[PDB]
């Protein structure tokens, strides 16, 4: 009898439960680094006293002992340093063995083999493979997160909420992160194998996967495709031919599957929250605690001015220059880890933003940027801090440009307009947690001023009191199909009567400020006595905005006002029209492996038919993949009632998400929390 | 619903050209890859060509590279297949199909047209030659014996066959035709008879080929 | 590239469940989505599964799909078989350029007794040899289900060149028949010891043989 292995029992279910990886829909062994796992190995005899056993684990195509991507270890007393295997018991020919990886092991798929030295002879057999993840339960892991409820929210929750809209109207969409769905973990690992860092130098790339700063950076870079290799094709054009409207996605699952199955070819099309939701799946799946952050009025300053410019003409059109300097909202991610590169005070939440691309400066993403560091203006620290600081801190400079004379002049500088209502989902609920005070000191504080100057450090001319002030107000209900009713309020603050000319326009836009089409314009001249206040009505019919309104449902309203011998005043507001309501109802108790009938309700509010009607539904633990249901054309003002079944696989509170689309309403959303009984 | 209407198929001689068209309705044409897929009679589905939604990525089966060209016209909602250098093995029903996938470079055919038929033959109209399939010289005189007619090398379809001017129908089966690499059709007809009828009852197949206006009779006789 | 290999045929009785597999020859079955199509006689194909296991709007819930990484295969499973499910079924996938179809599987929903084919192989007639041609004719009848494979052999040599075969079709007694042909020159005919027609039905192979030097 020369010593050899007969079987190995990996005790997969037990180890996954101990490792907090039991929720993944997978039969693989999935472990977290730095933590032991127990296997039973059946040999052909008891251990001979001359003989030797070594385990070998390796990851990646060029594994190296000096790079920590290969390790060779005997049965021993154990180890801090590295990998170790402890013989816990021998029972006949069966060995109870506790194997452990270091807290600094690279994540990813590993192979394990066993090399047996016996009778001046050596055997070797492949034992199997496993996946190794970051370990936010382990206090020596860089991703350690100590609080149980936060760890559950930020690693283990597969349903999410992303805040959208504007500073005037904060809404939300549901997002199915779906990191436990079939093949999603494996696809998120594949992101790392598809990076340019991997193709160029796989040995270095794999060895680098021990560092969450590196993994987060590579992951964030891959989501918004900057070549033909990333996950999503970005598109803020309003025109989504060849693809899906970015607003029609409800989760990361469909995206990541389509990516993989297409040969890792970009999925068409995403915008910033689509990237953030997808990046969030990847991070949580690999064990980096993470969450989605929305910033309102988010500035795009690549110039390190800490200021952006927006251009108008005297006729009250937004111009293309700077029309997207300040996004109504912009969504990114935070991940949770220490920053060994920065030091003890810069640990915790780190900004990771898949959206940015500046090829001229080699930026395929931003971060990780210590939020602590952003807030103190330590913008010399790695990575992408000047851009991130600016996103939440920039000044807004408004310019007039007159195409007839080619003259440009600075109208106003406005501080405190950018970086507002910075929002993320609360732990354990759908509430909006405001985290503005994490990125910034309080508005118009000494600290705020110190931080801004500090940061600025590391990176006519007169001032008017105009006679006339203005404000755009909404009258009544903003909804697609209904007319838009606004009023421009002007008030004369000077000691004398003034005559003001007002030129006004209204442009459909994408939420970042991409201008689509003029749909309405007006002008007015009026005299106002001192303190007089006047109202000019703005009415935009359905027929006027319908042809150019995008899934954003947004319209940019501008009024440039001018009294003789005074600087212009620019009054502006981006409005959001509500979709018609789409309702979901569960018609009986949700229980695991029992059919649950669900009802969609929709009333067409248009006096025309809506056609090409599709209802799309998904929800982790409720449906496998997604349901797409062809809905009959609705006539004018007609209602629709669609019944469908889900079939829950997992108990607890789950999230059902529904998209209804037709020719006139590209992406109406609905969501339901459903409590699923066991 | 989605409609795909194919046209341009017909009879053409080897070496020459056809151009197929497919006009689509009932979806956004420019959202989807489109494909030609073909099926030779009695055979499987063979993909011919794909064109991407934006016309900028094309693929061809190896069997057609060099010879066929796919294109599409957005304004006409149409897809085209230019088929040069035709060979009789290109004979097939040619389906236009819409790709299922929106916004990824995966492929599958969610809607198929009814197809346009392409037949590649250099044949002229031609009456068949009829050859006997003589019953086994070894046949139990208390069992049964197969005999038949091979109806060879006719064009175009169809042929019909009777036995004993339609007096014999019990045990008769006339098979579907095969199109040969020659571009001519053949079929057979068989009748299973009492082994003991052989060499007393007469067996004649009557072969009718309306396109050549020919009826051919063939007496089929036991061999030794 | 790769090929997709399906069984030539499968049968089951009404109400029962059947599974049809589709094996990918290289690369993982799970790398690319798998679709399934139903094709009835005289009709264009229609899609019954897309994206491995999703059911198109209006396909019944008796149709499901799955992937088995163990065997590198996809499967279509039809529960509660009805007579109308009898059809040809094709799987399909792609690499990032090319679309691949499997060979197709005939699904018989059993409604008569299984019945082994009767096979007769006819040598070339003297009339045909006199016209300087030769055709071996292999006629196959009275079988059910209506699915067969036919192979030809000339001495030690499997033969495909000059072979044409018909798809099975219904006889007037409700069973099936098929025909196969081998065209050869009279020299080829006379220069082999023997030729065989081999017919496989429901996993059993019958062989018929003729020779230029023997009465048959």
With the C-alpha atoms ordered A148, A154, A156, A162, is the resulting torsion angle positive or negative?
Answer: positive
B27, B30, B106 member nearest A242 (Cβ)? B30
End-to-end CA distance of chain B: 64
Distance CA A337, CA C115 (A): 71
User: Which subunits count as partners of chain B given 3+ CB pairs below 8 Å?
Assistant: A, C
Q: Do B104 and A261 touch (CB under 8 A)?
A: yes
User: Of B124, B137, B148, which Cα lies nearest the Cα of B218?
Assistant: B148
Measure A287 CA to nearest chain B CA, in Å. Answer: 28
d(CA B52, CA B56): 6
Residues placed in the known binding site of A: 221, 224, 226-227, 229, 301, 303, 305, 307, 324, 393, 415, 443, 448
Q: Give the residue from A114, A141, A111 showing the smallest Cα distance to A29.
A: A111
Q: Which residue of A has its CA nearest to B31?
A: A242
Helix axes A196-207, A184-193, angle to 10 degrees: 100
Is residue B34 within 8 A of residue B21, CB to CB? The reply is no
Please report, to the nearest 10 degrees, the dihedral formed by the alpha carbons of residues B64, B65, B68, B74 taken in order.
120
User: Whole-angstrom Cα distance, residue A221 to residue A232?
Assistant: 11
Q: How far apart are CA B73 and CA B81, in angstroms?
A: 12
Token digits of residue A107: 């994540």
Please name the helix (run of DSSP H) or strand (run of DSSP E) that holds residue A14, with its range, or none.
helix A12-18
Beta-bridge partners for A122: A117
Tokens of C26: 């290289």
Residue A415 CB-density burial (10 A; 0-12 exposed, 13-18 middle, 19+ buried): middle
**Residues A20 and A137 sit within 8 Å (Cβ to Cβ):** yes
Give residue A664's region: left, alpha or beta (phi > 0; psi -120 to 50). Answer: alpha
Q: What is the largest CA-CA distance in chain C?
A: 62
Q: By CB neighbour count within 10 A (0-12 exposed, 13-18 middle, 19+ buried), where does C124 fall?
A: buried
* Rg over CA atoms, chain C: 20
Q: Provide the chain A residues 269-298 that lie in CB contact (below 8 A) with chain B.
A: 269
Distance, in Å, from the CA atom of A644 to the CA atom of A616, rounded to the nearest integer, reads: 11
Contacts of C144 (CB under 8 A, 6+ apart): C108, C112, C113, C114, C115, C175, C176
Distance CA(C69)–CA(C28), nearest Å, equals 7
Yes or no, beta carbons of A241 and B103 under 8 Å apart: no
With tokens 């990237």, the residue in question is: A275
Place of tokens 């060499």: B199
Residues A466 and A563 sit within 8 Å (Cβ to Cβ): yes
C89 and B44 Cβ atoms separated by less than 8 Å: no
How many C-beta atoms surround the C-beta of residue C32 within 10 A? 24
Enter the tokens of residue A489: 């309020």
Query: Which of chain A's residues have a Cβ under 8 Å away from the Cβ of C53?
Result: 624-625
Please provide the DSSP assignment of B195-217 as one string. GGGTTTS--EEEEEEGGGTEEEE
Residues A291 and A251: their CA atoms lie apart, in Å, by: 14
- What torsion do the CA atoms of A217, A221, A224, A230 make, to the nearest 10 degrees? -130
Closest by Cα among A677, A678, A673 to A157:
A673
CA dihedral for C130, C133, C136, C139, sign (positive or negative) = negative
A290 within 8 A of A482, measured Cβ to Cβ:
no
Instruction: Write phi, then psi, for C107 (nearest 5 degrees).
Output: -105, 115
Residues 6-65 of C with CB under 8 A from B: 32-33, 35, 37, 39, 44-47, 50-51, 56
Alpha helices in A343-410 (DSSP H): 371-376, 385-393
Alpha-carbon Rg for chain B, nearest whole angstrom, is 24
Q: Is A330 a catalytic residue?
A: yes
The two tokens of residue A64 are 């190296």
State the DSSP H helix or E strand holding residue C195, giving kind and residue range, or none if neither.
strand C195-201
Q: DSSP for A29-49, please give it.
A: -EEETTSEEEEEEEESSSPPS
Whole-angstrom CA distances from A302 to A359, A363, A366, A385, A453 are 12, 11, 12, 11, 18
Distance CA A488, CA A526 (A): 12
CA distance A275 to A597: 32
Taking residue C59's Cβ as centre, other Cβ atoms within 10 Å add up to 17
Rounded Cα distance between B188 and B204, Å, is 13
Going by C-alpha positions, the residue among A92, A102, A82, A98 that lies closest to residue A44 is A92
Tell how many helices (H) and how many strands (E) occur in chain C. 2, 19
Q: How distant is the Cα of A644 from the closest Cα of chain C, in angstroms? A: 12
Spell out the alpha helix ranges (H) of chain C.
126-130, 186-190
Q: Would you state the torsion angle of the CA atoms of residues A267, A269, A274, A275, taken in this order, to the nearest 10 degrees? A: 60
| 3-state secondary structure string across A88-150 | EEEECCEEEEEEECCCCCCCEEEEEEEEEEECCEEEEEEEEEEEEECCCCCCCCCCCCCCHHH
Instruction: Give dist(CA B83, CA C188) in Å, integer.
Output: 36
Distance CA(B208)–CA(B152), nearest Å, equals: 12
Rg (CA), chain A: 29
Q: Tally the C-alpha atoms within 13 A of residue A5's C-alpha that lie toward its C-beta.
A: 23
Instruction: Give the contacts of A216 (CB within 8 A, at least 6 positions apart).
Output: A283, A288, A335, A337, A350, A352, A367, A368
- Cis geometry, peptide bond prior to residue A189 (ω within 30 degrees of 0): no
Pairing of strands A639-646, A326-336: unpaired
Residue entry with tokens 């969501």: A671
Half-sphere exposure of A510 (CA within 13 A, CB side): 22
Residues 6 or more apart in contact with residue A322 via CB below 8 angstroms: A308, A309, A310, A311, A399
β-pairing verdict for A30-32 and A121-133:
parallel
Among A231, A237, A372, A398, which Cα is nearest to A313's? A398
Nearest to B105 among A241, A244, A263 (CB): A263
In this complex, is the C-beta atom of C174 within 8 Å of any C-beta atom belonging to chain B?
Answer: no
Which token pair is B203?
Answer: 């067996």
Any idea what DSSP says for residue A441? P
| Peptide bond connecting B156 to the previous residue in cis, omega within 30 degrees of 0 | yes
Q: Which residues of B touch C164 (CB under 8 A)?
A: 178-180, 186
Residues A37 and A28: beta-carbon distance below 8 Å: no
CA–CA separation, A253 vs B143, rounded Å?
Answer: 67
Question: Residues 3 to 32 of B: which have CB under 8 A from any A CB?
Answer: 27-28, 30-31
- For B85, other C-beta atoms within 10 Å of its C-beta total 13
Q: Are A563 and A516 in contact (CB under 8 A)?
A: no
Question: Of A460, A466, A495, nearest to A566 (Cα)?
Answer: A466
Q: Which whole-number Å values give the CA distances from C148 to B44, C41, C179, in the listed order? A: 15, 17, 10
CB under 8 Å to A479, separation ≥6 — which residues?
A: A577, A578, A579, A580, A605
What is d(CA A115, CA A96) in angstroms, rounded to the nearest whole number?
A: 18
Residue with tokens 């036995």: B163
The strand pair at A652-661 and A515-528 is best described as unpaired
From the list C146, C133, C161, C167, the residue with the least C-alpha distance to C10 is C146
State how far the Cα of A195 lies from the Cα of B186, in Å rounded to an integer.
59
Q: Is A661 helix (H, G, I), strand (E, B) or coil?
A: strand
Rounded Cα distance, C168 and C150, in Å = 11
Catalytic annotation, pick one of A188, A272, A366, A613: A272
A178 strand-pairing partners: none
The crossing angle, in degrees rounded to 10, of helices A272-286 and A184-193 is 100
Could you say which of A158, A245, A353, A552 is catalytic?
A353
Whole-number Å distance between alpha carbons of B20 and B10: 10
Residues in chain C with CB shorter than 8 Å from the CB of A630 are 57-58
Q: Does A272 qualify as catalytic in the annotation?
A: yes
Q: How far apart are CA A261 and CA B100, in angstroms?
A: 14
What residues have CB less than 8 Å from B34, skipping those under 6 apart? B22, B24, B50, B51, B72, B79, B96, B97, B98, B99
| End-to-end CA separation in angstroms for chain A | 51
Q: After which residues is chain C broken (C to N over 2.5 A)?
A: none
β-bridge partners, C38: C46, C89
Q: Is A609 exposed, middle or buried (0-12, 13-18, 19+ CB in 10 A)?
A: middle
Contacts with B106 from chain C: Cβ below 8 Å: 32-33, 51, 94
A613 phi, psi to nearest 5 deg? -75, 120
CA angle in degrees (0–180, nearest 5) for B90-B96-B99: 125
Buried b (16+ CB within 10 A) or exposed e, B56-66: eeebbbeebee
- To which H or E segment does residue C87 belong? strand C87-94
Parallel, antiparallel or unpaired: strands B116-120 and B11-12? parallel
Strand intervals (E) in chain B = 3-7, 11-12, 18-25, 34-39, 46-51, 58-60, 68-73, 78-83, 92-99, 109-112, 116-120, 129-133, 144-154, 160-163, 172-174, 178-179, 185-194, 204-209, 214-219
Candidates A330, A378, A561, A574; catalytic one: A330
Q: In this complex, do A263 and C96 lie within 8 Å of one another by their Cβ atoms?
A: yes
In eight-state DSSP terms, residue A346 is: G
Interface test with A, best of B104, B106, B107, B108 (most A CBs within 10 A): B104
Edge-to-edge order in the sheet of strand A626-631: A590-591, A668-677, A652-661, A613-618, A626-631
How many CA atoms, within 13 angstroms, populate the side-chain half-sphere of residue B193? 25
Rounded CA separation C36/C64 (Å): 10
Write the CA distances from C131 to A14, B186, C14, C164, C186, integer angstroms: 79, 16, 51, 20, 9
B11-40 in b/e form (b: 16+ CB < 10 A) is ebeeeeebebbbbbeebebebbbbbbbbbe
The gap between the terminal CA atoms of chain C, to the nearest Å, is 46
Which among C70, C32, C37, C73 has a CA at the least distance from the CA of C51? C32
Residue with tokens 């030609």: B36
Distances (CA, A) of A267 to A117, A260, A643, B104, C153: 51, 10, 30, 5, 51
Cα A158 to chain centroid distance, Å, stands at 13
Q: Of A472, A506, A508, A314, give the one whose Cα is nearest residue A407.
A: A314
Q: Does B56 touch chain A (CB under 8 A)?
A: no
Two tokens, residue B139: 């046949």
C-alpha–C-alpha distance, residues A580 and A603, integer Å: 8
């Amino acid at each position: 009898a020369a010593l050899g292995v007969q079987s190995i029992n990996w005790q997969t279910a037990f180890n996954r439960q101990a490792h907090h990886t039991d929720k993944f829909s997978s039969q693989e062994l999935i472990l977290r680094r730095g933590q032991n796992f127990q296997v039973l190995m059946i040999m052909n005899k008891g251990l001979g006293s001359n003989e030797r056993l070594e385990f070998i684990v390796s990851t990646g195509p060029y594994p190296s002992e000096s790079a920590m991507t290969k390790a060779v270890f005997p049965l021993s007393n154990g180890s801090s340093g590295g990998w170790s295997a402890v013989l816990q018991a021998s029972n006949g020919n069966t060995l109870t063995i506790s194997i452990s990886s270091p807290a600094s092991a690279p994540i990813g798929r590993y192979t394990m083999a066993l090399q047996i030295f016996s009778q001046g002879g050596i055997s070797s057999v492949k034992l199997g493979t496993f996946i190794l993840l970051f370990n936010p339960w382990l206090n020596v892991d860089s991703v350690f997160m100590g609080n149980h409820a936060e760890r559950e929210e930020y690693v283990q929750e597969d349903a999410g909420i992303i805040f959208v809209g504007s500073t005037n109207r904060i809404g939300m969409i549901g997002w199915n992160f779906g990191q436990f769905e079939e093949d999603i973990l494996s696809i998120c690992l594949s992101i790392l194998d598809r990076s340019l860092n991997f193709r160029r130098d796989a040995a270095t790339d794999v060895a680098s996967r021990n560092d969450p700063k590196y993994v987060g950076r590579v992951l964030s870079a891959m989501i918004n495709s900057n070549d033909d290799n990333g996950v999503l094709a970005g598109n803020w054009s309003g025109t989504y031919t060849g693809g899906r409207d970015p607003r029609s996605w409800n989760g990361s699952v469909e995206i990541l599957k389509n990516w993989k199955k297409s040969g890792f070819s970009p999925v068409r099309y995403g915008q910033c929250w689509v990237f953030a939701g997808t990046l969030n799946t990847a991070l949580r799946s690999l064990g980096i605690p993470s969450r989605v952050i929305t910033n309102f009025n988010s500035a795009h300053d690549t110039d390190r001015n800490l200021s952006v410019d927006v251009y108008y003409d005297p006729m009250g059109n937004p111009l293309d220059k700077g029309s997207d300097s300040v996004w109504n909202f912009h969504v990114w991610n935070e991940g949770w880890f220490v920053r060994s590169d920065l030091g003890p005070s810069y640990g915790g939440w780190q900004v990771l933003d898949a959206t940015p691309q500046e090829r001229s400066q080699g930026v395929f993403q931003c971060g990780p940027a210590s939020v602590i560091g952003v807030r103190e203006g330590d913008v010399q620290l790695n990575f992408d801090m000047p851009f991130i600081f600016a996103e939440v801190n920039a000044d807004r400079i408004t310019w007039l440009y007159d195409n007839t004379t080619g003259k440009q002049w600075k109208n106003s500088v406005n501080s405190h307009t950018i970086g507002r209502y910075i929002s993320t989902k609360a732990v354990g609920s759908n509430a909006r947690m405001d985290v503005t005070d994490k990125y910034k000191y309080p508005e118009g504080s000494d600290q705020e001023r110190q931080v801004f100057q500090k940061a600025l450090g590391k990176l006519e001319t007169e001032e008017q009191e105009p006679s006339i002030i203005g404000k755009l107000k909404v009258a009544g209900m903003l909804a697609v199909g209904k007319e838009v009713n606004l009023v421009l309020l002007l008030k004369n603050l000077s000691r004398d009567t003034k005559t003001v000319t007002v030129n006004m326009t209204a442009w459909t836009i994408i939420y970042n400020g991409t201008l689509v089409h003029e749909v309405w314009k007006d002008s007015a001249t009026m005299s106002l006595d001192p303190e007089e206040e006047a109202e000019h009505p703005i009415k935009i019919s359905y027929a006027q905005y319908e042809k150019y309104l995008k899934s954003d449902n947004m319209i940019r309203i501008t009024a440039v006002c001018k009294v003789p011998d005074e600087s212009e005043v620019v009054v502006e507001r981006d409005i959001i029209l509500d979709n018609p309501t789409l309702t979901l109802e569960v018609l009986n108790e949700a229980r695991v492996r029992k059919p649950v009938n669900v009802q969609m309700l929709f009333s067409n509010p248009l006096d025309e038919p809506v056609r090409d009607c599709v209802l799309m539904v998904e929800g982790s633990g409720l449906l496998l993949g997604n349901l797409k249901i062809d809905v009959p054309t609705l006539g004018p003002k007609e209602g629709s009632r669609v019944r469908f079944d889900i079939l829950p696989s997992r108990s607890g509170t789950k999230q059902l998400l529904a998209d209804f689309s037709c020719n006139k309403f590209p992406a109406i959303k609905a969501m339901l929390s459903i409590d699923v009984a066991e | 619903e989605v409609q795909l209407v194919e046209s341009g198929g017909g009879l053409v001689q080897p070496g020459r050209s056809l151009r197929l068209s497919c006009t689509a309705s009932g979806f956004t044409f420019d959202d989807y890859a489109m494909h030609w897929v073909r099926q030779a009679p009695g055979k499987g589905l063979e993909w011919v060509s794909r064109i991407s939604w934006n016309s900028r990525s094309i693929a061809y089966a190896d069997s057609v590279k060099g010879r066929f060209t796919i294109s599409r016209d957005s304004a006409k909602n149409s897809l085209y297949l230019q088929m040069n250098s035709l060979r009789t093995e290109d004979t097939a029903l040619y389906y236009c199909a819409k790709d299922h996938y929106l916004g990824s470079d995966s492929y599958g055919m969610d809607v198929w047209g009814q197809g346009t038929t392409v037949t590649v033959s250099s044949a002229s109209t031609k009456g068949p030659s009829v050859f006997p399939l003589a019953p086994s010289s070894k046949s139990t005189s208390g069992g049964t014996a197969a005999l038949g007619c091979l109806v060879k090398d006719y064009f175009p379809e169809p042929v019909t066959v009777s036995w004993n001017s339609g007096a014999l129908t019990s045990g008769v089966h006339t098979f579907p035709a095969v199109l040969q690499s020659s571009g001519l059709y053949s079929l057979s007809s068989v009748v299973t008879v009492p082994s003991s009828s052989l060499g007393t009852q007469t067996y004649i197949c009557n072969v009718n080929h309306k396109p050549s206006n020919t009826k051919v009779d063939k007496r089929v006789e036991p061999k030794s | 590239n790769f090929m997709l290999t399906q069984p030539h045929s499968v049968s089951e009785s009404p109400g029962k469940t059947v599974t049809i597999s589709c094996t990918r020859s290289s690369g993982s079955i799970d790398s690319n989505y798998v679709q399934w199509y139903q094709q009835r006689p005289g009709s264009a194909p229609t899609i019954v599964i897309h994206e491995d296991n999703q059911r198109p709007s209006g396909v019944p819930d008796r149709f499901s799909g799955s992937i088995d990484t163990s065997s590198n295969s996809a499967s279509l499973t039809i529960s509660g078989l009805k007579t109308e499910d009898e059809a040809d079924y094709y799987c399909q996938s792609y690499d990032p350029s090319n679309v691949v179809f499997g060979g197709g599987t005939k699904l018989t929903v059993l409604g008569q007794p299984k019945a082994a084919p009767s096979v007769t192989l006819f040598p070339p007639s003297s009339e045909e040899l006199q016209a300087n041609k030769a055709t071996l004719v292999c006629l196959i009848s009275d079988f059910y289900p209506g699915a067969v494979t036919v192979a030809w052999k000339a001495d030690s040599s499997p033969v495909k060149a000059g072979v044409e075969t018909t798809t099975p079709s219904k006889q007037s007694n409700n069973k099936y028949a098929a025909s196969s042909y081998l065209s050869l020159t009279p020299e080829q005919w006379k220069s082999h010891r023997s030729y065989s027609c081999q017919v496989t039905h429901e996993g059993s192979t019958v062989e018929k043989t003729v020779a230029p030097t023997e009465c048959s």
